[PDB]
Design a protein around this ligand. Structure first.
Ligand SMILES: CC(C)CN(C[C@@H](O)[C@H](Cc1ccccc1)NC(=O)O[C@H]1CO[C@H]2OCC[C@H]21)S(=O)(=O)c1ccc2c(c1)CC[C@H]2O
Lengths: 99, 99
């Protein structure tokens, strides 16, 4: 749906058979999730933000249902304060900014 | 305009008679800009993100023209890796997420 920004643009996501809330973040190039058991192989990685940097596990080809729209892509898992859906996954469900 | 997310949603802003490029970030509640000389009084403040926290100068009632749309609101100035337009100003120009 079309979402106003008077509140945080949070949506319900399905990933690894698990129900979570994530932030539709146009300022994030990648998707980062709080710690979870995501199945498959991974490769260490590091991502930076306003506060500095955090170490994450990079998992490629992960299925994620975002508000009912399906997408497959890289999902990073690490000590993020919040689950953020980045542009890597937003492009797959056809999200756009409109003003 | 309508903006797709295959590339970073960067836009041109005018603040303090000075031209800059900023990221339209629906994941940011407020606006933070890299170091610049903005006129007036300010108030120290702590803001947190991925990696931790940074100290910034808070400027209230600041005018910003974002891609031709004018808005007035609080602008934080500090060691951000990139200029971010947060939800405080995105709502002023009528931005929405659509999918
Ligand atoms: C985490 C999120 C909940 C909030 N952040 C917004 C998020 O969009 C940021 C933006 C950014 C930041 C730095 C560099 C480049 C982009 N991206 C992000 O960390 O993304 C990461 C994963 O992808 C990677 O690519 C980009 C970076 C990597 S914030 O900036 O920490 C923030 C927090 C509190 C406040 C504000 C801002 C305004 C004042 C207060 O309201």
């Amino acid at each position: 749906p079309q979402i106003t920004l008077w509140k945080r643009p949070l949506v319900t996501i399905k990933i690894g058979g698990q129900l979570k809330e994530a932030l539709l973040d146009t300022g994030a190039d990648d998707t980062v999730l709080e710690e979870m058991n995501l199945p498959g192989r991974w490769k260490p990685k590091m991502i930076g933000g306003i506060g500095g940097f955090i170490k994450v596990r990079q998992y490629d080809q992960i299925l994620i249902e975002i508000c009912g729209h399906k997408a497959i892509g890289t999902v990073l898992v690490g000590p993020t304060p919040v689950n953020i859906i980045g542009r890597n996954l937003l492009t797959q469900i056809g999200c756009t900014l409109n003003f």
